[PDB]
Amino acid sequence: STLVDELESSFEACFASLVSQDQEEIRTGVDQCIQKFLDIARQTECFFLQKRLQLSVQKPEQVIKEDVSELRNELQRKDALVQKHLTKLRHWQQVLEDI
Amino acid sequence: DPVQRYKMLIPQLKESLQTLMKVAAQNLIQNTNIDNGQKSSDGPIQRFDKCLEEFYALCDQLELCLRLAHECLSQSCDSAKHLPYPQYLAVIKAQISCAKDIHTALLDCANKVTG
Amino acid sequence: MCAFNKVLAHFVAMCDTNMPFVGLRLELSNLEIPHQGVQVEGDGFSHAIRLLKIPPCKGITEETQKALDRSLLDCTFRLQGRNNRTWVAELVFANCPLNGTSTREQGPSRHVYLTYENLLSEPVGGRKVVEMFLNDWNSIARLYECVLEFARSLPDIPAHLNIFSEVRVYNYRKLILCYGTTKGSSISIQWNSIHQKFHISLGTVGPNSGCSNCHNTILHQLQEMFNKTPNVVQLLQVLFDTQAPLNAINKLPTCFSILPQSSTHIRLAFRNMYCIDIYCRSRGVVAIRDGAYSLFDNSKLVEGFYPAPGLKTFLNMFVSWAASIPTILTHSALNILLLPSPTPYLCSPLERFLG
Amino acid sequence: KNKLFIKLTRLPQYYIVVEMLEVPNKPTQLSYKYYFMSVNP
Amino acid sequence: NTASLCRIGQETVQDIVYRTMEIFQLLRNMQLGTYQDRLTKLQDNLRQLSVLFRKLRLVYDKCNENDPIPVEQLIPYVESEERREIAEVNKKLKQKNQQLKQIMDQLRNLIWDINAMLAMRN
Amino acid sequence: QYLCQPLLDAVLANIRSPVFNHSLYRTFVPAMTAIHGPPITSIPSVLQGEVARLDPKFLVNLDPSHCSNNGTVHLICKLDDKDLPSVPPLELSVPADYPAQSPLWIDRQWQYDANPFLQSVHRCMTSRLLQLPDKHSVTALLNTWAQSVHQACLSAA
Amino acid sequence: SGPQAFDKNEINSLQSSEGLLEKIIKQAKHIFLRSRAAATIDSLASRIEDPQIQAHWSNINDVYESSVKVLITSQGYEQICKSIQLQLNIGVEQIRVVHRDGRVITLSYQEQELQDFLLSQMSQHQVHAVQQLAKVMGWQVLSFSNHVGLGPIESIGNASAITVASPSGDYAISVRNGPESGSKIMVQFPRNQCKDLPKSDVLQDNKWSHLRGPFKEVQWNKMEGRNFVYKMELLMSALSPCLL
Amino acid sequence: VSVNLEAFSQAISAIQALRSSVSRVFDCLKDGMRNKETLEGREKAFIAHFQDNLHSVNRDLNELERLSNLVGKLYSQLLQAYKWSNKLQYHAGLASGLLNQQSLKRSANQMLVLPPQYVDDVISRIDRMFPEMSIHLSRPNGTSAMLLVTLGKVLKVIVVMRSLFIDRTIVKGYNENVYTEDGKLDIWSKSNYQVFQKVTDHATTALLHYQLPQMPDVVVRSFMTWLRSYIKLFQAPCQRCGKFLQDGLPPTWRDFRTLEAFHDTCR
Ligand SMILES: [Zn+2]
């Protein structure tokens, strides 16, 4: 129940051999803990993707809003890059003028 | 010493195996000669059970010696892995405290996740 | 621009993806595994070899072969990976006998993906690939026998085991039981056809146990007891008995040396002079003894152990040569006799006695 | 005598042989013939 | 909004696994002042990971609050002002990308000319 | 062999005595039980597998006619594919003990007459049947049938 | 050359007066060829937006050599799909391509060759992305063929194909991407889930309604996503047990 | 030394195997002949099991003897911390390997500048190991460091970096003049032989293959580790065809992650 909590429990189970009071015991325990951990991680990602798919088919204006936001960040990032580059160009023109 | 004790214990082990197999065969042949209709001398039949436990005692001595030597050599390997005697005690309490710190960091935060 | 010659590129690609299956068809036919031929599979852009009947097996009952061959549906071989020399066989079984606490509790068709890669010598469809496949199928059969017995015995189980252990994983190649009151420890049983044994492997998976499995001291004798009689309920009984003694014994210092004899016959040795036998038994009872004495000629002593004087009286508190006869306990008196209490340095009671 | 032997390297003992022939009427076109040889001196 | 919350929730699970991998690497390297520095890095990583778990439970509850259409009805088998906003920003960064391409081409050509002219002087 | 031979000689000397396991018990169980403690605490399904995995071109069904629920079984297939033309249904006689042997194609020469195209289908199909390896499946027959129909489409045009 | 004995080649290399015209024409040839290669790469980056394509020209040139590094990654998955990277060594009249997986191909000075080459590499990227994505989402890669040999003949280069299976069995996804006729992608359902499947009287058990017999085809436009691998990830998540 | 550790653990398991096999002999003899339908079949089964058990005892005794031939020779808090440290180190090694094999990171995005002194420290650190490789850094053109890695009497590799990340490599033979007329590095040349042009191509795939995104020290160290394996050119045979020569070429392909020789035609 509530895949978050299974993720938390499995993550705490990854450390159970260290926090208490040779090789093959460690190996099989590590393999089983890490495999259950990654399996519940993939199930959580699958849940988020299914919910995003249902939103993208039912309420498509939200997707367009996120695209608007990402294109605006692309614009601002491009202008920041060109401004830094332009300041470096003007500094190099002032350097190369002085030979 | 443990290598030399091991060399001591090997031919005793082969001797105990020889006596155990031969005495098993003698006791089985005597019991089949009573069970089937056969004459057989009573004689110095030399019981089987003592030979079996003697073999087990020799294997206990061998596994004891080898577990001791393996613990000693693994001990020396990790001891070399990690000159005034107070400097020794200072770095030893340093190492113990540092490992305690790693352990309590892991325990406190793996409990801080849930419960 | 007609300078590509598309037909030759198509013929070269067609030969290089099809001709690996021809050697596999020949090596399947030499071992007389009935198969439908190399067929285009579903969509047009693939290839497959579907088996029909994998040759029975060697050394399992006919109930198990009738239960296997009515549970198989399909065993396709497909070719994948770069260089096109990685086969993957997709077995799919119906009517799985037991589910897991891992969420394979879905529709009763389990898929087992075996994968084989021959070396760069001994070409892509060879004797080695089909030999590895028959060994893997043999492994699945020789564990399916035990799983059939266990799933038969599952409704009528002694009902303290039913609280003790639940099944985590059944892949048809492994069986991972997870036992403990908190379900923190785990055994994993798997047939290994190199040695032709079973392999029991122990691990700690779960956030309440010691730093080890605590059955790892008796693992060799566990594997041997399982190979002599492969019964899962026997294995659960042995774990259920010897867990509470061994969890105490592993907390002893090391002075104390632990020689397990045969399983449920742990034998402790203090330094070198003193010995004490321990027999785990049924219903939370452990019988201890003197070790150094004989089980036969009472006058004689064992080769390396000197008898402990006064041992019997000390054990009696928890409950001449009369240390040689055993003295049963509760596992709780064993906890008290072995877990280090301060003194009436944190030593044990027992090591105080022998000291 | 105008042929091309294309050995497959993932599986040797297999050759694709391209034979190029002149189409009789068209002097600026070729005709290809693809054979499949196998090989064991 | 919520269809970006799903993206953040995916990114949290992607970060948790990567962060556990970095934790296990830190525990791999720790050899019994840099002792204390590795202690600080370990404790800070564990703090950030607990923050990530709390954030993940928040995002899970938010997306699970806000379904009438079951999946596998959503896949196509064979047999309004925000759109204008999209077209506006698309035309805007079309022009921005073409100007960036001109800047990039002139920088490339200047670098190539510098390297050729300096290569021939020897 | 070495270090174990006299046991082997004793036991191989004393096989076929009815009191043998009595002798082994009397000579071995008290030692072991002292040391080790007391002892322990209609249609054959191969064809269903073939038919369940066929391509949706084929439409294999049982013949209403012929003996049923007995040794051999009999099939009337079909062919559906936009690329391929409609053809005579095809009749198959699968033996009991189906793997390790080859099924038989019930030949109907009279319906493969009365057209040139069905004649080409039939000639090409008998050719690929002669080309087949032994102990082939049902799906090998069905796929040679579909390839024969395709070659008889191409050879004609 | 006398005591440290030289061959013919070193002797002729010491004494080889190459005129000014050959040197200048080789430099101008390299300039023009390099400009054409940059133009074709930027035209593919402008026109095609489906995978992506990147370039990183080197710092240092000669008068007869330059170098790029061409990546082809999908848009939001630059950690997953890093399996197709190229290096082109633009000589005087040849472009020498070294792949990531040890394939060396020498093109010619025409700009149709480089265009068809990079088009085939985008087509193979659209399959290697799905393979390394099914690595992440736990799906099992049943079959993979880098240059498939069945089906229609593609004009530019060969076509690639995978088929992956859902981790709980039932569903399968087959991709076949080609450089001229791209992306015939189709799922495979279990039986007892098509329901237009014409049943047969030979199957008298219910165990055979669990094999995946039927095959339907996904219409790839109208699928939601602004990318290919994004659409594949949504398709893979749709064929999972609905966890909610 | 570790070989004594492995031999002692080996012989421990040998004693346990010997003891259990002897007890198995006597346990199977305790039960007696089973039934097994055919009388001939039951005799065969009993004889076979007894013989196998005896053979296993003999094998275990022989293995113990072979190990005997090969054997060589508050405080508890410190040992507990030592054991727990080795346990944590091995546990973390396994878990780190399993997790970085399967990462779920898809993109770096959510929602190069280095001192040349650092590059020299890194590359001198690599040059200290691998005693048969000598790396000689120079900077003829700016901050882009150029490296001559000589390798035995076999190779001379010219590596052209760009901000502590390998960019181009050229592999030439030992005698070949890697210097121009003026004694600078010949950054743009080829090597007159078929073999070393093949190894330049394989080295370019090697620098395209070993790509971590951020940390570049593992990249250069792994590239030099791979490059070190070429010292057995002209001596290693191909691991697919056995021979040394395919079309007059030695096996030029040292495979990544398992440095084995192949002719590139044998992939
Ligand atoms: Zn070779």
PDB file of N, CA, C and O in Angstrom, chain C residues 5 7-8 11-12 15-16 19-20 83 124, chain D residues 4 6 8 10-11 14 16 18 32 34 36:
ATOM      1  N   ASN C   5      22.718   0.757 -54.499  1.00  0.00           N
ATOM      2  CA  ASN C   5      22.486  -0.667 -54.772  1.00  0.00           C
ATOM      3  C   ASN C   5      21.827  -1.358 -53.574  1.00  0.00           C
ATOM      4  O   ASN C   5      22.428  -2.166 -52.873  1.00  0.00           O
ATOM      5  N   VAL C   7      19.622  -3.579 -53.224  1.00  0.00           N
ATOM      6  CA  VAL C   7      19.331  -5.002 -53.237  1.00  0.00           C
ATOM      7  C   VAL C   7      20.453  -5.792 -52.601  1.00  0.00           C
ATOM      8  O   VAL C   7      20.210  -6.754 -51.868  1.00  0.00           O
ATOM      9  N   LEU C   8      21.694  -5.380 -52.829  1.00  0.00           N
ATOM     10  CA  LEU C   8      22.817  -6.113 -52.266  1.00  0.00           C
ATOM     11  C   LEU C   8      22.910  -5.903 -50.770  1.00  0.00           C
ATOM     12  O   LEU C   8      23.201  -6.846 -50.025  1.00  0.00           O
ATOM     13  N   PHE C  11      20.347  -8.146 -49.307  1.00  0.00           N
ATOM     14  CA  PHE C  11      20.689  -9.564 -49.287  1.00  0.00           C
ATOM     15  C   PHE C  11      21.731  -9.866 -48.235  1.00  0.00           C
ATOM     16  O   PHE C  11      21.674 -10.915 -47.582  1.00  0.00           O
ATOM     17  N   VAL C  12      22.679  -8.952 -48.038  1.00  0.00           N
ATOM     18  CA  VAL C  12      23.706  -9.161 -47.029  1.00  0.00           C
ATOM     19  C   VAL C  12      23.101  -9.117 -45.635  1.00  0.00           C
ATOM     20  O   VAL C  12      23.387  -9.983 -44.794  1.00  0.00           O
ATOM     21  N   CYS C  15      21.026 -12.402 -45.124  1.00  0.00           N
ATOM     22  CA  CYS C  15      21.864 -13.550 -44.799  1.00  0.00           C
ATOM     23  C   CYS C  15      22.414 -13.451 -43.389  1.00  0.00           C
ATOM     24  O   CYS C  15      22.361 -14.426 -42.634  1.00  0.00           O
ATOM     25  N   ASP C  16      22.856 -12.269 -42.982  1.00  0.00           N
ATOM     26  CA  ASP C  16      23.524 -12.156 -41.692  1.00  0.00           C
ATOM     27  C   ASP C  16      22.540 -12.208 -40.530  1.00  0.00           C
ATOM     28  O   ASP C  16      22.936 -12.501 -39.401  1.00  0.00           O
ATOM     29  N   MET C  19      20.921 -16.626 -41.273  1.00  0.00           N
ATOM     30  CA  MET C  19      21.843 -17.749 -41.127  1.00  0.00           C
ATOM     31  C   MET C  19      22.306 -18.136 -39.721  1.00  0.00           C
ATOM     32  O   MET C  19      22.806 -19.256 -39.574  1.00  0.00           O
ATOM     33  N   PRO C  20      22.241 -17.291 -38.683  1.00  0.00           N
ATOM     34  CA  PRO C  20      22.410 -17.846 -37.332  1.00  0.00           C
ATOM     35  C   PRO C  20      21.367 -18.859 -36.922  1.00  0.00           C
ATOM     36  O   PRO C  20      21.655 -19.707 -36.077  1.00  0.00           O
ATOM     37  N   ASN C  83      26.446  -8.102 -32.520  1.00  0.00           N
ATOM     38  CA  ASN C  83      27.093  -9.217 -33.218  1.00  0.00           C
ATOM     39  C   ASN C  83      26.091 -10.291 -33.610  1.00  0.00           C
ATOM     40  O   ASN C  83      26.451 -11.220 -34.339  1.00  0.00           O
ATOM     41  N   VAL C 124      27.570 -19.547 -33.671  1.00  0.00           N
ATOM     42  CA  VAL C 124      26.475 -18.907 -32.935  1.00  0.00           C
ATOM     43  C   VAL C 124      25.370 -19.884 -32.565  1.00  0.00           C
ATOM     44  O   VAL C 124      24.709 -19.726 -31.530  1.00  0.00           O
TER      45      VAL C 124
ATOM     46  N   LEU D   4      32.484 -10.280 -57.514  1.00  0.00           N
ATOM     47  CA  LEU D   4      32.857  -9.701 -56.239  1.00  0.00           C
ATOM     48  C   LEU D   4      32.427 -10.659 -55.147  1.00  0.00           C
ATOM     49  O   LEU D   4      31.250 -11.008 -55.052  1.00  0.00           O
ATOM     50  N   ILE D   6      31.868 -11.388 -51.344  1.00  0.00           N
ATOM     51  CA  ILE D   6      31.597 -10.678 -50.113  1.00  0.00           C
ATOM     52  C   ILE D   6      31.514 -11.719 -49.016  1.00  0.00           C
ATOM     53  O   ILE D   6      30.513 -12.431 -48.900  1.00  0.00           O
ATOM     54  N   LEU D   8      31.017 -13.040 -45.331  1.00  0.00           N
ATOM     55  CA  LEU D   8      30.398 -12.635 -44.080  1.00  0.00           C
ATOM     56  C   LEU D   8      31.355 -12.967 -42.949  1.00  0.00           C
ATOM     57  O   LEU D   8      31.898 -14.072 -42.900  1.00  0.00           O
ATOM     58  N   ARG D  10      30.846 -12.425 -39.405  1.00  0.00           N
ATOM     59  CA  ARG D  10      30.289 -12.960 -38.171  1.00  0.00           C
ATOM     60  C   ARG D  10      30.140 -14.461 -38.274  1.00  0.00           C
ATOM     61  O   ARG D  10      30.245 -15.185 -37.281  1.00  0.00           O
ATOM     62  N   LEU D  11      29.872 -14.936 -39.476  1.00  0.00           N
ATOM     63  CA  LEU D  11      29.906 -16.350 -39.803  1.00  0.00           C
ATOM     64  C   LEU D  11      30.692 -16.527 -41.095  1.00  0.00           C
ATOM     65  O   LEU D  11      30.168 -16.275 -42.186  1.00  0.00           O
ATOM     66  N   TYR D  14      30.744 -18.440 -45.612  1.00  0.00           N
ATOM     67  CA  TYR D  14      29.583 -17.941 -46.326  1.00  0.00           C
ATOM     68  C   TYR D  14      29.958 -16.715 -47.132  1.00  0.00           C
ATOM     69  O   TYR D  14      30.477 -15.729 -46.595  1.00  0.00           O
ATOM     70  N   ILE D  16      28.698 -14.115 -50.448  1.00  0.00           N
ATOM     71  CA  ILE D  16      27.735 -13.645 -51.428  1.00  0.00           C
ATOM     72  C   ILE D  16      28.510 -13.164 -52.639  1.00  0.00           C
ATOM     73  O   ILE D  16      29.402 -12.324 -52.518  1.00  0.00           O
ATOM     74  N   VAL D  18      28.652 -11.455 -56.286  1.00  0.00           N
ATOM     75  CA  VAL D  18      27.981 -10.572 -57.225  1.00  0.00           C
ATOM     76  C   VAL D  18      28.664 -10.722 -58.566  1.00  0.00           C
ATOM     77  O   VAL D  18      29.876 -10.520 -58.674  1.00  0.00           O
ATOM     78  N   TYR D  32      23.018  -7.274 -62.386  1.00  0.00           N
ATOM     79  CA  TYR D  32      23.678  -7.958 -61.297  1.00  0.00           C
ATOM     80  C   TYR D  32      23.076  -9.338 -61.132  1.00  0.00           C
ATOM     81  O   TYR D  32      21.902  -9.554 -61.443  1.00  0.00           O
ATOM     82  N   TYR D  34      23.235 -12.349 -58.045  1.00  0.00           N
ATOM     83  CA  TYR D  34      23.702 -12.619 -56.699  1.00  0.00           C
ATOM     84  C   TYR D  34      23.647 -14.111 -56.450  1.00  0.00           C
ATOM     85  O   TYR D  34      22.592 -14.730 -56.598  1.00  0.00           O
ATOM     86  N   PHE D  36      24.996 -17.401 -53.714  1.00  0.00           N
ATOM     87  CA  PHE D  36      25.269 -17.672 -52.308  1.00  0.00           C
ATOM     88  C   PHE D  36      26.190 -18.879 -52.240  1.00  0.00           C
ATOM     89  O   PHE D  36      25.728 -20.015 -52.356  1.00  0.00           O
TER      90      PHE D  36
END
